[PDB]
Write a protein that binds this DNA or RNA. Sequence first.
RNA 1: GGCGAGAGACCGAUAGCGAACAAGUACAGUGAUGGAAAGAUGAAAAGAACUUUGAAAAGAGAGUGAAAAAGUACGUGAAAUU
RNA 2: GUGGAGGCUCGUAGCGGUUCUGACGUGCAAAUCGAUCGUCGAAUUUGGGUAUAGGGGCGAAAGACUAAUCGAACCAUCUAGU
RNA 3: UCUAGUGCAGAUCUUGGUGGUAGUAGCAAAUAUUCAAAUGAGAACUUUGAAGACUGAAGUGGGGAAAGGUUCCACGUCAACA
RNA 4: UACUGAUAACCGCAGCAGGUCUCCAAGGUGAACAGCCUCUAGUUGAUAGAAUAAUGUAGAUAAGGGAAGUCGGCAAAAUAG
RNA 5: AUGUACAACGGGGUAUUGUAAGCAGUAGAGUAGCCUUGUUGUUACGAUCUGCUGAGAUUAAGCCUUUGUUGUCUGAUUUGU
Lengths: 50, 109, 85, 63
Amino acid sequence: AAQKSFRIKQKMAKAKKQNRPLPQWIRLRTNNTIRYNAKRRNWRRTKMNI
Amino acid sequence: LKDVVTREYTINLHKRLHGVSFKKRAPRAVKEIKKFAKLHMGTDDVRLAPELNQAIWKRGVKGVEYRLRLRISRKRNEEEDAKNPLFSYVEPVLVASAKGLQTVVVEED
Amino acid sequence: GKGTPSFGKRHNKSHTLCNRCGRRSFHVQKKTCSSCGYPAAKTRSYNWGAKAKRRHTTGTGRMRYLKHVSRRFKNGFQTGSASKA
Amino acid sequence: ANLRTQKRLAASVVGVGKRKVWLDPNETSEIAQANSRNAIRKLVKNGTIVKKAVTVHSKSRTR
RNA sequence: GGCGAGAGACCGAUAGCGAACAAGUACAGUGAUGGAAAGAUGAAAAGAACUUUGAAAAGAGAGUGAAAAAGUACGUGAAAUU
RNA sequence: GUGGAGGCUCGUAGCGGUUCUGACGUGCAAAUCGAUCGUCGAAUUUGGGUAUAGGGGCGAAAGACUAAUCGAACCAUCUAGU
RNA sequence: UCUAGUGCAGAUCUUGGUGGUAGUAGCAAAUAUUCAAAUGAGAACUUUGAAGACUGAAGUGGGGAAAGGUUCCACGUCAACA
RNA sequence: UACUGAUAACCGCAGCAGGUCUCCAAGGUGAACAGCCUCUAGUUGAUAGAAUAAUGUAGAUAAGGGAAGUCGGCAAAAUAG
RNA sequence: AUGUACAACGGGGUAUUGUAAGCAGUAGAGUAGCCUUGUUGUUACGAUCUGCUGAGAUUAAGCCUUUGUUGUCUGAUUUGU
């Protein structure tokens, strides 16, 4: 909520920095087996449980 | 082909709306006016003036006037030529009382 | 209305995060984690929770010191430094 | 085009609601260029936006 | 169990550790706990210049390649079903 | 006349949940919708905090409730139980 | 010659996949939309203007707690979701 | 310390008619933050079009009689300030 | 597919309801005000009433009729003993 705690805000910031796609140069590298991100997280679908 | 004309008509919305739901009287009036113009001018493209829409929606949805006096203008088309070179422009005629009138032709002036 | 509307009434967290395990198991009104046993000294484990051990045990982390322990045993726990042959 | 936020900024600026603010369509390109409240104020000044004639509620019958 | 080495009449991706892959992962649950799926282009990206139709995606040509009856919905490519 | 009591009464919100054994009944919904009804200043309604934990609790007592689970919760193990 | 985790039509079998039903049931609560212009490839729904209506201050208004986490605002933008 | 606070931001597997604490509260009618209408504020959202058969659901009316119906006057009607 | 053609309008008829608006009135419960004081004095308010007014409005959407007005009347597909 608005009146929140710093731990919550810390985890939220980390989540926000996670919530974005792959880099395409990583898609370009050698021996690469990654096509997409699968740790992707959207507030509508799944909650953090914190 | 020809006939870039204007005319003035009269229409009986009462008999064209008799039996109709009270939340659709006016929209059906609009559709019936497009149909009226199609009949009387053989056009498919029919544009109605917002003045006319207001004159229909004046007394509301279920208060549409029994009669209406129209100024139709069969005109030539422009704008990335469509199926038809001709369309119709429907407009009102502010008359005090729209009873006892018969239809007439109207010229460019 | 034991189901849906009650789930609507459901909004106050019984559990929150713990500072020893980070798992959201810290019962506030008891002041205990349901997974590590905080604020107890020991770590909570059971030999019926074999999977739990396997999940929370040694090697699932960085082992910031313990890998180097075996390297150092190999080299015999030596002090000093090299000599530039 | 889309002028939602322009209408909203104008509402807040003038101090009325969006059901009062009026944007003429014949200056749509100008209003879409406009992005900031300063420009909205210029537009109100030059009359491209008007507050609006308030809807009347009369009390003659009651009196 | 831990660390390091070697082997097998063992399993060969619905098998074998739950996990051959960013697996105790995503995900669920208040929580304890639960707990997946998912391997293969080609020797080499040479991963399709250029033209044309189309709003574009794509198509038809062209071309690469031994092979596009290998086109990242990629080895082969069964059946049900179409 | 004054005054303005009451686990008084009519009746809103609010709390509930009688009847239609109505609608829906592969639903809006794993108990809802509509009308009709009960009560509505009190043994009232209710948030937050707090205590009570499984043969245990809590129960103005229905064997009711105890996280869509109760004539003894849920998790794992004993357990590939017989 | 040896050796087995050795032969499936079934087990309301397990996992995955596919169908007919079937272009079907159905997408019907919450009084309600219409005219033109602009954009754009394309407009029943996007934007504007005009009109008609609603919530009708115990409101579909304005602000907050719990919870949610960046949904806030902008620019671009429509393969998937709506 | 933004923002929603809910027929789309919470929980109900979801953009579910459910549920979830609260503050402010205009004019008229009327006893009344009842119901109806309106102003400020906000929405104009819920897949649409054309027809208007049976059957449905929701809503209404019906001569004369007046519970004979039915388990039962269920339901509706009358009553009403 | 150029005619006792068809339609949209208009007019007339038939029906329904019940006497429109507007104007006027020495109609009008009564009440104020005036001064030329009244010898109906007049001006203003005022539910309603009377006349013009069986008037006016509606009247085919599945009513009748038309000597009127204005329009329309060559698009597509298929078929052989």
